[PDB]
Amino acid sequence: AAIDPEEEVIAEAEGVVHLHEPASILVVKARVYPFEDDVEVSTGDRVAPGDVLADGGKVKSDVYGRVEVDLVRNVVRVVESYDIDARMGAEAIQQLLKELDLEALEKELLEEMKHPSRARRAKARKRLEVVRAFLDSGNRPEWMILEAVPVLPPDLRPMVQVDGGRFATSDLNDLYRRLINRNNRLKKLLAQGAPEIIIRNEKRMLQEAVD
Amino acid sequence: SDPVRQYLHEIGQVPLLTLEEEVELARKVEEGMEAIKKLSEITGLDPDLIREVVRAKILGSARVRHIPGLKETLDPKTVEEIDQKLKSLPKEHKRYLHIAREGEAARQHLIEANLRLVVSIAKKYTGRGLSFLDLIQEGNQGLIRAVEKFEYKRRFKFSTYATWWIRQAINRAIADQARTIRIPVHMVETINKLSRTARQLQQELGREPTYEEIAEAMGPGWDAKRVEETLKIAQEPVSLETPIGDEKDSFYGDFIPDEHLPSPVDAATQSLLSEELEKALSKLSEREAMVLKLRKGLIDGREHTLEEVGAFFGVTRERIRQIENKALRKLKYHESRTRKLRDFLD
Amino acid sequence: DVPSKIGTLLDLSATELEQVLYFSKYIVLDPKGAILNGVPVEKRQLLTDEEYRELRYGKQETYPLPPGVDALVKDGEEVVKGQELAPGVVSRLDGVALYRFPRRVRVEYVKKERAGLRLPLAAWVEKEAYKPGEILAELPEPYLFRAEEEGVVELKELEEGAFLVLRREDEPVATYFLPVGMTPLVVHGEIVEKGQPLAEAKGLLRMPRQ
DNA sequence: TATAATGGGAGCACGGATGCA
DNA sequence: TGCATCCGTGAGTAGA
Ligand SMILES: [Mg+2]
Numbered sequence: 183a184a185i186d187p188e189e190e191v192i193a194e195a196e197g198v199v200h201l202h203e204p205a206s207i208l209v210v211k212a213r214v215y216p217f218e219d220d221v222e223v224s225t226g227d228r229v230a231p232g233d234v235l236a237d238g239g240k241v242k243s244d245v246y247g248r249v250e251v252d253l254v255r256n257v258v259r260v261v262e263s264y265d266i267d268a269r270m271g272a273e274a275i276q277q278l279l280k281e282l283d284l285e286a287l288e289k290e291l292l293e294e295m296k297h298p299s300r301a302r303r304a305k306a307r308k309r310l311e312v313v314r315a316f317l318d319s320g321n322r323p324e325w326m327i328l329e330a331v332p333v334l335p336p337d338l339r340p341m342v343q344v345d346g347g348r349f350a351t352s353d354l355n356d357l358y359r360r361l362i363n364r365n366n367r368l369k370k371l372l373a374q375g376a377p378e379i380i381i382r383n384e385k386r387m388l389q390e391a392v393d
Numbered sequence: 394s395d396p397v398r399q400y401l402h403e404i405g406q407v408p409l410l411t412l413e414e415e416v417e418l419a420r421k422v423e424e425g426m427e428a429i430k431k432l433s434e435i436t437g438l439d440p441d442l443i444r445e446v447v448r449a450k451i452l453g454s455a456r457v458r459h460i461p462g463l464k465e466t467l468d469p470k471t472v473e474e475i476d477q478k479l480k481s482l483p484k485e486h487k488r489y490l491h492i493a494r495e496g497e498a499a500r501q502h503l504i505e506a507n508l509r510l511v512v513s514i515a516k517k518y519t520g521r522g523l524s525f526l527d528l529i530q531e532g533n534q535g536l537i538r539a540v541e542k543f544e545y546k547r548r549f550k551f552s553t554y555a556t557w558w559i560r561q562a563i564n565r566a567i568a569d570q571a572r573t574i575r576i577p578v579h580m581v582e583t584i585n586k587l588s589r590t591a592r593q594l595q596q597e598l599g600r601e602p603t604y605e606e607i608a609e610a611m612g613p614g615w616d617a618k619r620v621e622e623t624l625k626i627a628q629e630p631v632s633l634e635t636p637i638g639d640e641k642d643s644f645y646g647d648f649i650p651d652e653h654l655p656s657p658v659d660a661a662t663q664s665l666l667s668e669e670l671e672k673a674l675s676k677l678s679e680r681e682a683m684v685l686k687l688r689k690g691l692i693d694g695r696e697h698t699l700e701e702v703g704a705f706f707g708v709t710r711e712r713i714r715q716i717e718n719k720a721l722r723k724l725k726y727h728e729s730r731t732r733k734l735r736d737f738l739d
Numbered sequence: 740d741v742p743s744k745i746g747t748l749l750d751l752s753a754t755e756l757e758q759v760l761y762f763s764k765y766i767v768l769d770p771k772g773a774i775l776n777g778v779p780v781e782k783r784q785l786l787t788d789e790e791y792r793e794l795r796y797g798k799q800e801t802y803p804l805p806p807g808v809d810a811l812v813k814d815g816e817e818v819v820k821g822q823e824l825a826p827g828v829v830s831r832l833d834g835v836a837l838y839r840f841p842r843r844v845r846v847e848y849v850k851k852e853r854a855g856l857r858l859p860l861a862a863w864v865e866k867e868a869y870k871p872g873e874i875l876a877e878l879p880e881p882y883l884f885r886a887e888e889e890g891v892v893e894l895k896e897l898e899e900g901a902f903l904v905l906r907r908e909d910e911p912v913a914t915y916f917l918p919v920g921m922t923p924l925v926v927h928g929e930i931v932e933k934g935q936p937l938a939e940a941k942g943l944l945r946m947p948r949q
Numbered sequence: 950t951a952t953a954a955t956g957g958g959a960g961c962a963c964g965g966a967t968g969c970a
Numbered sequence: 971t972g973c974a975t976c977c978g979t980g981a982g983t984a985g986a
Contacts, residue, residue: 199844201814203807206803207812209831247797248796257815263797264773268768270765275745275760275766323748
């Protein structure tokens with residue numbers, strides 16, 4: 183098939199097709215599952231071993247993987263992959279902080295405090311001080327990560343007109359501006375389905391803006 | 394350690410396409426959008442909703458978020474409902490689903506492949522008031538617009554069509570975010586034009602041009618006053634933390650008084666004003682003075698209309714005003730004898 | 740602020756926390772039964788970008804072929820590491836090979852026709868059918884296959900062997916088949932008569948491979 | 950909204966505390 | 971256990 187109908191290639195009579203001289207060759211680690219009739223999964227779906235792929239459930243998947251449905255070659259190909267949840271930044275860190283049970287870690291560190299090594303007792307103490315601090319205070323560790331950044335009242339970061347009629351302002355306004363701009367841009371990028379790289383960079387910039 | 398180096402490294406991880414690859418991805422994208430339109434015609438749902446669900450399944454469990462454009466909130470339950478609603482279609486109608494999926498994947502790969510161009514364009518825009526990475530990100534938005542609007546039918550390289558949108562986005566950003574006090578884009582264009590004009594004028598004349606000369610080189614409609622007001626409105630504010638001395642000792646903002654809050658002298662002035670005004674207002678018959686205060690809002694802090702201030706004490710209309718004046722007549726008596734009100738008039 | 744409070748709580752050094760927060764490396768919040776380098780993914784493990792891409796999206800590689808060259812392997816064929824993908828290309832990994840943008844499409848068109856051949860009785864070995872490469876006949880002596888009809892010669896030459904179609908005017912009057920070991924004595928667009936040698940079949944003649 | 954364009958550019962001194970070899 | 975790294979300190983008022 184081509185852009186202009188006159189440049190298209192149409193078979194004159196009955197025959198078989200052979201593809202030669204490709205631009206390149208792509209080697210993939212995957213499993214090929216040729217399907218005769220109909221496929222019950224689509225490209226982008228993730229599949230564990232034993233999941234129905236095509237042909238009413240006759241052909242299934244041997245391994246974990248991501249689904250690529252080839253309509254041209256008439257085959258459901260499963261690229262070997264895992265569903266792993268591995269994240270980056272303050273989101274992941276906040277998750278880890280939320281999952282923490284402070285009493286348990288206090289117990290573990292207490293058991294660590296009985297170790298004959300001086301250094302290990304020292305580290306265990308240094309950690310247990312923080313843990314017990316959070317325990318006594320009633321503060322949750324995940325609060326060390328900001329979901330909502332406070333805004334200082336405008337009179338403590340004034341925009342004022344000087345004697346000459348010109349304006350003088352606080353740098354906190356500029357910092358706040360950077361933060362708001364990058365946050366808004368991030369939200370738009372998320373709504374528009376930007377690639378992982380762009381979003382990642384934007385999040386980094388956001389973190390450094392809050393910094 | 395360096396965000397820019399890190400991002401440039403993350404950029405070099407995606408290899409650049411070739412002509413066939415570019416045309417392939419573009420084709421898959423266009424045919425993907427067409428497939429989405431087809432599924433819209435078939436299912437009878439919203440093209441935006443279908444597109445967002447397909448995109449949700451392509452991006453995976455990593456990202457799900459509500460889109461402002463959608464009439465319904467976007468959640469994994471909904472994406473599962475719509476996905477299973479799309480998979481329930483017959484094979485020929487189920488084909489467009491696969492087409493749309495591979496289309497979105499192709500879109501992702503296409504955007505990810507061109508990220509270098511955005512950087513090479515944004516490197517020329519440094520020093521406009523925006524950071525390098527900001528320009529790169531806005532340029533990335535431009536690149537996204539380019540991907541979504543591109544047509545491979547015209548046999549044009551993607552860089553050609555993309556460059557325009559990238560420059561457009563970068564410029565819009567520079568015009569929008571560079572000022573603490575926001576100015577509209579057209580006015581920004583006007584100011585930049587004025588700057589270039591003045592620069593040409595000083596270039597040829599060998600001296601800094603006046604408002605009149607600028608008015609001349611700007612053509613018709615432009616006089617000295619307009620140039621002056623435009624330059625006045627183009628002035629950027631200054632930082633309160635701007636260094637004063639030779640050390641870190643003092644700041645600019647320490648020399649600026651607060652004109653808003655009343656000084657103790659002003660407070661005592663208003664207080665004693667109310668005091669003396671209460672001192673000389675009891676000199677005569679109560680109801681008329683209280684009618685005077687009723688008009689001037691000493692009592693309730695509000696001016697009452699003739700019919701209202703009339704209806705207050707049981708009278709009505711024309712009399713009231715003639716009483717106020719009358720009060721103000723007799724008010725001209727008492728004070729004039731004790732003369733206590735002079736200084737408060739400033 | 741050293742020592743890091745968050746780092747202390749989650750048991751992470753400065754470098755690790757920097758790398759996670761600032762988007763250098765990935766931190767695992769759940770394995771989902773992932774395996775890397777033979778050892779299963781442990782929770783709270785630090786993954787590089789390459790490791791995360793390989794784990795999440797799988798491993799693959801593209802190998803450029805010099806323009807004008809043909810692949811040594813087919814499309815959709817399993818490949819072993821070290822096995823050459825071309826004369827100048829060696830595949831680094833194992834898996835399924837796929838053709839990227841074929842520049843030439845060779846279409847083999849199926850043709851089923853009816854031809855004829857005159858042979859000596861002794862030389863011909865009687866068979867109900869003939870496989871490619873299988874001996875059709877064996878000649879004690881040079882033998883010439885003469886034209887049984889007058890007309891214009893149309894010589895259609897395949898890889899090996901040929902079809903000679905004789906036609907008077909616009910209508911073909913004859914179709915002859917010349918197997919391997921048979922040398923055409925005529926050219927394309929040649930006029931011949933009855934009994935004039937079309938080709939010489941000498942020695943041992945067999946069906947063409949095509 | 951349409952030739953093609955695809956990885957930046959600048960820039961002393963002593964202490965406590967922790968990290969590492 | 972000791973060498974080495976980062977980080978954080980370094981008079982006051984006046985004036986400008
Ligand atoms: Mg003028």
